[PDB]
Amino acid sequence: CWLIRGPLEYVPSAKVEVVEERQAIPLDQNEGIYVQDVKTGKVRAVIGSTY
Amino acid sequence: EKSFFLQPGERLERGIQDVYVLSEQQGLLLKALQPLEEGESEEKVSHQAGD
Secondary structure, eight states: OOOOOSSOOOOOOTTOOOOOOOOOOOOOTTOEEEEEOTTTOOEEEEESSOO | OOOOOOOTTOOOTTSSOOOOOOOTTTOOOOOOOSSOBSSOSTTOOOBOTTO
16 A cells, blocks of 8 residues: 555545545644654654645 | 355365454454464464464
8 A cells, every 4th residue: 555645536446445635734944743664663853844 | 255055965164164363453353273284374474283
């Protein structure tokens, strides 16, 4: 599984299943969230821009 | 894809099961094997009975 965003219109393919309907978090110049990379296990802080 | 006329004296062990598709990154299946079989899996790797 992977994700597509951006200014597009999408028809899920015969073979693809829309798992999450994601909406990006707007972050202040000076605020942010902690993601975790499930692959890596890596947990970082993403701050500054909207993510 | 198949349409299947079960011959006389056939039976579906577990009806119409769906193919495992494994959690891309972190989904795993662990499987024993009733009888010994060589290059038989989709891996073309032999396994001893119970292995």
